[model samples]
Target: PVTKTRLIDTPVRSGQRIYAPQCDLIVTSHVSAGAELIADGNIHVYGMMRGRALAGASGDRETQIFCTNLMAELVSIAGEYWLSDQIPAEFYGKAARLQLVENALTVQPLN
Candidate 1:
């Protein structure tokens, strides 16, 4: 049997934006459309993502973005992204995984 870890509640609002000056990770349960999920480090969305996910929004090229369901309108890792009006059209509703190395962005299906 496996034990589950429960998360405590915090006073964070939906439209509120918080900046992390240090390298950290942003893991969310679910992100709705029009919601902005920004991170200086890596971003992981365990649930469906349907909004903007900006990794390395501050211009750090070593960031990454991972999601179980890739419904996001936009996903940028290390300031590089697959920009288009064709979002899910480009990724084809597949799970998205992004990684950055040597100032380059690597993205593909999560399988």
Candidate 2:
């Protein structure tokens, strides 16, 4: 019963891109490396995240990114971004949430 929430239950392979303009994007499968996801609102991945995920595309820094298994190449909230190399080793493959805190991307353990 949610409005403006786009749900995807398929694998996002390499070279694939999924964008949900002005809405939240939810993926129930793995996001392979080289794949991309963009949403004006929030972004959620129920499975592994190995690609790029960008949220708050419309400049809303309040939006966030969630992943069950964070192994992403890149993730952004609003215009702030962090590459896999920038992610801490502790959260690299853990369930986590990425949000804006004091105008910076912050990672928190989800489990």
Candidate 3:
């Protein structure tokens, strides 16, 4: 198995923001609603995601977004997006997990 371990940014108790720059990835725990997650690679939220978790912020085709809980208004993965207003009621407040394979983004449920 190819276990590619990444040095993830573990936020401190004092509250640390993991910056996913124009060409980087970030996996976060919790982000306030109405906030924005901008990155070029991928944005993974393991905890509550109630904001705009955006991937491909720099217009990178290899970007993605993953969240354990989806309460956000908008999300963008590899330039593709689903507006919360357009989503089904069953999807609201549900889990969201995304991945990038072969330059493509795959989204699915977590639980």
Candidate 4:
């Protein structure tokens, strides 16, 4: 069974909020700092990601977020969240992945 995915071909600007219930979201452009993307499954950003990405909004802990650049204001998975200040310096401006592990939000370099 294949999962549903929504793709945004344009940039997600500030003040924009996108919600993909029970589906994954793929952004081909940059996500502005104030924009927010919410999905139940996962989020994949092909360009820079400077906004907020909230995955697992429906309580699925396996949800993940992958981006080419990690400079988001906030990132969350399964209710656990992390602010920009909490993101490691190494992950800033770097390709990264965000996931929930043991009820904690973990941000790691995409290897």
Candidate 5:
């Protein structure tokens, strides 16, 4: 069978939430703050990412989050999380890649 991916073409509004169970998620537009994004697999945000992005929600540590802009309120991978205040000084407002590293949430430059 082919791997499944959920794609979102419209901008995500505040107070909204989306989940992709057992599949990757692809967001092609901006995500407004207060929106929640959850995926059991990987998550890719092609536009501004200002909401909460949770990847590997089912404890898959290898899953990751790829985001074009790094202004998220929260990011989690495999149960590990980083709140806005916990994000690195250099990573905020930048492109970012988030994954689990040694059981810790690691933030890396996307580009």
Candidate 6:
């Protein structure tokens, strides 16, 4: 059986690809620019995030991506993706969360 969540205590280096297809993935450290994380549920980055994070990879539209500092190269939910440059200026380097809302990817400030 798969655990409900997987915790990563170390930083994710460039070129690393982590897949949590059955549960949520939680990162405690920063993620490098080329690193990628995929989760079936939510993806939580408690520290700086600069890599790609794809949640709801298996078609779960409710999946979300939460980061402490949003400098992500890419953020996707339910197959919808947004590149770094496509992100709004207000969300850059700020705490944020991305989710699928009404068939569109929405980025919201993390309260």
Give the number of the best model, judged by lDDT: 2
Question: Which sections of candidate 2 miss by over 4 Å?
Answer: 1-3
- Scored against the true structure, residue 108 in model 4 reaches a CA lDDT of 79
Whole-model lDDT per candidate: 0.63, 0.93, 0.60, 0.90, 0.89, 0.91
Number of the top candidate by TM-score? 6
lDDT of 5 by residue, 57-86 (tens): 998999999988889999999889999999
Give Cα distance to truth, residue 12, candidate 4, Å: 0.4
- Name the lDDT value of residue 106 in candidate 1: 62
- List ranges where model 5 is wrong by over 4 Å: 1-3
Per-model TM-score, in order, reads 0.67, 0.95, 0.63, 0.94, 0.94, 0.95
Q: State, as a TM-score between 0 and 1, how close model 2 is to the true structure.
A: 0.95
- What value of lDDT does candidate 2 attain over all alpha carbons? 0.93
Q: What TM-score number comes out for model 3?
A: 0.63
Which consecutive 10 residues in model 2 have the weakest lDDT in total? 1-10
> What are the RMSDs of all candidates, in order?
6.2, 1.9, 6.0, 2.1, 1.8, 1.0
lDDT of 1 at 87: 54
Number of clashes recorded per candidate: 0, 0, 0, 0, 0, 0
Candidate with the larger TM-score of 2 and 5: 2
Model 3: lowest-lDDT 10 consecutive positions: 1-10
Q: Please report, as a residue range, the 10-residue window in candidate 1 with the lowest summed lDDT.
A: 1-10
lDDT winner between candidates 4 and 5: 4
Candidate 6, residues 34-103, lDDT tens digits: the string is: 9999988899998889999999989999889999999999999978999999999899999998988899
